[PDB]
Amino acid sequence: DLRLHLLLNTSVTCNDGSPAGYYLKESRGSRWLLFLEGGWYCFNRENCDSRYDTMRRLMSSRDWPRTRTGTGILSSQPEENPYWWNANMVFIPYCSSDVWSGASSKSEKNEYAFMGALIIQEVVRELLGRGLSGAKVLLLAGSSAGGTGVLLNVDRVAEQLEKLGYPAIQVRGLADSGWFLDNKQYRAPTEAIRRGIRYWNGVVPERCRRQFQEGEEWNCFFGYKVYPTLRSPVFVVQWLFDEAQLTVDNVHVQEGLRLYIQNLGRELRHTLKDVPASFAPACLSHEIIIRSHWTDVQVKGTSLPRALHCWDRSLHPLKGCPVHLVDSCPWPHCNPSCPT
Ligand SMILES: *[C@@H]1O[C@H](CO)[C@@H](O)[C@H](O)[C@H]1NC(C)=O
Ligand SMILES: CCC(=O)Nc1nc(C)cs1
Ligand SMILES: CCC(=O)Nc1nc(C)cs1
Numbered sequence: 001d002l003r004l005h006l007l008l009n010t011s012v013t014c015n016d017g018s019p020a021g022y023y024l025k026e027s028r029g030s031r032w033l034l035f036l037e038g039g040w041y042c043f044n045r046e047n048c049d050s051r052y053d054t055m056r057r058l059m060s061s062r063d064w065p066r067t068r069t070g071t072g073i074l075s076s077q078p079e080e081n082p083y084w085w086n087a088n089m090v091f092i093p094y095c096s097s098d099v100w101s102g103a104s105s106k107s108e109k110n111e112y113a114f115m116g117a118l119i120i121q122e123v124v125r126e127l128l129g130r131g132l133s134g135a136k137v138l139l140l141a142g143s144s145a146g147g148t149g150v151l152l153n154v155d156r157v158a159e160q161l162e163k164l165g166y167p168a169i170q171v172r173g174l175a176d177s178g179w180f181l182d183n184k185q186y187r188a189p190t191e192a193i194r195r196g197i198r199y200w201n202g203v204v205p206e207r208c209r210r211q212f213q214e215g216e217e218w219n220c221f222f223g224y225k226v227y228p229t230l231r232s233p234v235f236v237v238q239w240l241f242d243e244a245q246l247t248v249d250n251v252h253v254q255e256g257l258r259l260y261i262q263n264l265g266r267e268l269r270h271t272l273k274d275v276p277a278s279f280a281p282a283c284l285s286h287e288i289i290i291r292s293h294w295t296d297v298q299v300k301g302t303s304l305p306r307a308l309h310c311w312d313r314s315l316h317p318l319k320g321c322p323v324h325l326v327d328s329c330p331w332p333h334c335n336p337s338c339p340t
Helices: 045-054 116-128 147-162 189-200 206-213 218-221 225-229 244-249 255-271 304-314
Strands: 001-006 020-027 033-036 089-092 137-143 170-174 235-238 279-282 324-326
Touching: 001 089, 001 137, 020 116, 020 137, 020 304, 033 116, 033 147, 033 304, 045 255, 116 147, 147 170, 147 218, 147 235, 189 218, 206 218, 218 225, 235 304, 244 255
Parallel strands: 033 089, 033 137, 137 170, 170 235, 235 279, 279 324
Antiparallel strands: 001 020, 020 089
């Protein structure tokens, strides 16, 4: 079990002004995994009000429980988590509705606070006094909106630790199910994100901002565009036929739809050709890393926990221990190990 700590700086808040926080389980014999929860987002007063009625735990800490159980990559049992398992474990709840990009407080002009980028910085800050100062690796991981959040924030964490005087901590990223395409729909994300950035005062990585310039920062929310601007090592996990991608594409089988689905998989595979650390199975699904049975899926005979271990070794190719694992077969569940 991981134990809740609300942020000591109570000006760093969830949407409704309640304090943000993190859940922690220390492992004193180990030198850190910080995981970003996902859960869509909201981009105007009306749709944020709706989310506050029926998804309030994603906008407030008032009802959070005192503990949570670590699962998947957050599990401390080697049977469930062959990778790491002995690491210090941190789960950061998503309560900012801003894909972890916001830097704006609640005020007389703002009904809600959007502080995702500042929540991450404050968590890292308060952890340094609880043992993070002695770390050798900090892995910033996340699923869905949290996976996009890794891409937007990993280099800022590295810069923060350098400026605070901790140059020996190696910061790395693991982005799960947050690598989306701004593609043609079958019957939109780009417009919703463009409006969100204005509403949230959203921030993107500096090198990506300088490429796309004012008004075009929405481009940096799309993995294949922001990834080449990043300096920290990042491992990318993405289903080739992601259910959230298909949902925004208005897909819920005749020739037209067959060709659309096959072209989606081919496009995703193309965007990963130059990503040396990646795991991309040919399955229709969504998310992976915090599921208890995350060890079952294999690409070309290699599981995700093994691929991550091989990545660790590469950061010290390796005989029989690969890190670039992308299916080439063209239809959902052509890989027999896909989740049932
Ligand atoms: C609390 O966080 C805010 C936002 O980052 C910052 O401006 C302020 O200085 C912090 N306060 C303290 C006491 O650290
Ligand atoms: C919130 C996760 C999701 O389904 N969609 C996202 N789209 C972008 C562009 C970031 S997160
Ligand atoms: C990167 C060189 C290499 O093979 N690394 C190794 N790591 C272990 C754990 C044994 S050898």
